[PDB]
Each structure stands twice: as structure tokens, then as C-alpha cells.
Amino acid sequence: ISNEISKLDPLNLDAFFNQLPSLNQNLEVSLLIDKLREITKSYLPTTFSINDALAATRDLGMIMSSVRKLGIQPVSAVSDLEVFLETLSEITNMVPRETSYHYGPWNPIGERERRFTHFPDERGLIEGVRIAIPGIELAIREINQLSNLSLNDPAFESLAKSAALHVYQAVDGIGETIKKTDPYVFSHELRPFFDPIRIGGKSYIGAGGGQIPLFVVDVKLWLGNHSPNSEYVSFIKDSVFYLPPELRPICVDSLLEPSVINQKFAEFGSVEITDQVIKGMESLLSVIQVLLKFRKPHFQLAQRTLSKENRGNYTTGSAGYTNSFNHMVLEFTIEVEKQIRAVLAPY
Ligand code: HEM
Numbered sequence: 001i002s003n004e005i006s007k008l009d010p011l012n013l014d015a016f017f018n019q020l021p022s023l024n025q026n027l028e029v030s031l032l033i034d035k036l037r038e039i040t041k042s043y044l045p046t047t048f049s050i051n052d053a054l055a056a057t058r059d060l061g062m063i064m065s066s067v068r069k070l071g072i073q074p075v076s077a078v079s080d081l082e083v084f085l086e087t088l089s090e091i092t093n094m095v096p097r098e099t100s101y102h103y104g105p106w107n108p109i110g111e112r113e114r115r116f117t118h119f120p121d122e123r124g125l126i127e128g129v130r131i132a133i134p135g136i137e138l139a140i141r142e143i144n145q146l147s148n149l150s151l152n153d154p155a156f157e158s159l160a161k162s163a164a165l166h167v168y169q170a171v172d173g174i175g176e177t178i179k180k181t182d183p184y185v186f187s188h189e190l191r192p193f194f195d196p197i198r199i200g201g202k203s204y205i206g207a208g209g210g211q212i213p214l215f216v217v218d219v220k221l222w223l224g225n226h227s228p229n230s231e232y233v234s235f236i237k238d239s240v241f242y243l244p245p246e247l248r249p250i251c252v253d254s255l256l257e258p259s260v261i262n263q264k265f266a267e268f269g270s271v272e273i274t275d276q277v278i279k280g281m282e283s284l285l286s287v288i289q290v291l292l293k294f295r296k297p298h299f300q301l302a303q304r305t306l307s308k309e310n311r312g313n314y315t316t317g318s319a320g321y322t323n324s325f326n327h328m329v330l331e332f333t334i335e336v337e338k339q340i341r342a343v344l345a346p347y
């Protein structure tokens, strides 16, 4: 899917994107606005295939975010953008704005890579979500298959092992950020390109790491329908319709059903506890421990860049939360590791 979108240049902006970091560095807003005006007049978006509309949203969204970076609402300044983005989102059935999908897996590798700035630290955000997202999508489909297998079936253990290995891509992705993105450069140079944009009477947050579908893993795997009034369920609720449409039913079904681990805690204290059953209960613990290998260093990274020393003009991520939200998801995940460890303790 992604290589078919990353290869596209539907708005002929390849040469423009090799100038964009210098345009942004010199605050050349007139060339940004002019490029947005040329686009609405040069192109009939109703004629676009789905793949073209996804890549077009990627490219147009990034010029929009460069204008919003300066403090200007780009659709209030180029009012013809509105029906253009309207038309694009009817084709994508997605928000009229770029997300981490467009910035990561749909963003081409190499010389055509779309970047806001010349800073090498920006490569650490892009590669982070470009690595994490396909792996999480694989784990989503594998974890979804566990509701329908028995703890005693070896196919359960091997599928949950496949999921843990795929979730590791999120660890590989955040480790690329930690080693490439300076916290101070992030807050001062990159973070401003991810601010909300008003489009047809609604505000759309900018691309954000939290838009990788890790929360979909969580809802199916451990959260389920067990904490209705949580702030995490509020963030997931706000996130559903940012996901690719392909992922929305899994998320909605899982928010309305018991989680895998809740329903596997029942099976465990109800069936004959064999050796493969314990392997099955331990394959769930392994997956949870991989999310911790992502969430613990992620928390340290966000703490360092949101410190009084490094934070710049922001106290929040692009989704509007402080690191307390990250602490809250991390404590949830630790509580679940502790829960599985107790169920396994006699064995
Ligand atoms: C310097 C870089 C980064 C900083 C300062 C940062 C900070 C934050 C903040 C403040 C939040 C709270 C939600 C919000 O308000 O947007 C958040 C959420 C989140 N971000 Fe990051 N982030 C960074 C890079 C990344 C990267 C590269 C990824 C993916 C590879 C990522 C994945 C996530 C996830 C999954 C969440 C949801 C919470 C969770 O599931 O644990 N972040 N991040």
C-alpha cells in the first residue's frame, strides 16, 4: 500500500519539496501561498484515484502546515483550498490534512522525501513512524485473531509471538528518534510544523506520533470496554476517524467488546491449565512487555524535550496533551504486566 503512495507525485511538487526547507528557513510565506493558489487552479481533484488523493493530501497538507507554522490559517488565506480539501477527503474518506501515515510510510525514501526543514533531527521523527506503522498494522491483524483461538492451541502462542515481534518495530522506530532528534531542536525547530489547522469549521490537529495505531493494539489487547470514562478512551475516541478507514471497524468493535486479556484471564481460570496454556498466557505477557520497551524510553524522550530547559513555546504534543498522558498510558500497561504476572505466579 505505502510504496504505491510514496512513489506518487500527483501535484508535481517534487522540485518544490527540494526547496521547501529553504523556503521555510527564510520565512518565504508568499511562495507557500502562491503554491497553494496554483494547486487549486491547476488540478481537478475529483479526477483523482484514491492513491493520488492520499499522496496529494500528504503534499498539500505539508505546505498547509508550513503556512500554519507562521501563525496563518492557510484555508482562511486561500479560501479555494476548502472545496479542494473537501473533494480530496471525499475520495480518501480521511481527514483533509496529513497525518503520521502521510509523513512516515507514505513519505518516499531518499531524495524525494518530504521534509519541513533542513535539520537532520527531522529524519528521526520521519523514520520513527515510517518504521513503527507497518509493524503495528501487522500486530493489529495478528492480535485480532487471538479472540478466536484457545490458550491451549499452539497457534495462539505463535500468533502472539508474531505480534510481539511486529510491535518491536515500534521500539526500533522510537530508538531511531532518540538517537537522531535532539530534544531542544525538536521543540524549537520542528514541533511548530504540527499545529492545528481549521478546515470547514473544524480544527484538525497536525501529524503526531500518537497517530500510529498503537492505541488500536491497546484496545483489542487490554483496554477493551473496561474503563469507559478514562482520558485514554477520550483520546482514542478523538483518534478513530484519523485512522485509515481500513482500521476503524477493528477499533470500534474493540472499544465495545471485552479485551483479549480479560477474556483470556477467564479461560485461564476455567480450563485445564496445561503447558501450552501457560505458553499461551506468556505470549500475551511478551507482547505487553514489548509495548513497555516502546513506552518507557518514549516517556523519557518526551520528558527531556518538555523540560523547562528544552521545551520552547510548547507544553504539549501536537494532540494537545502533556507527558502526564504518556505517564497514564504507561502506568496502564505496567498494571497489565503486573496482572498477568500474578495469574502466572503459581505456575
Ligand atoms: C522528540 C520527539 C517526540 C516527542 C517530544 C513526543 C511527545 C509525545 C507527547 C507529548 C504525546 C502526548 C500526545 C500528544 O499530546 O500529542 C505523545 C503521544 C504518543 N507518541 Fe510521542 N513524541 C515524540 C516522538 C514520537 C515518535 C517518533 C513516535 C512513534 C515512533 C511517538 C509515538 C507516540 C505514541 C504511540 C503516543 C501515544 C501514547 C502511547 O501510546 O504511549 N512519539 N508523544
Ligand SMILES: NCCc1c[nH]c2ccccc12
Residues within 6 Å of the ligand: 125, 126, 128, 129, 191, 194, 207, 208, 209, 210, 317, 318
Ligand atoms: N508523538 C507526538 C510528538 C510529535 C509531534 N510532532 C511529531 C512529528 C513526527 C513524530 C512525532 C511528533
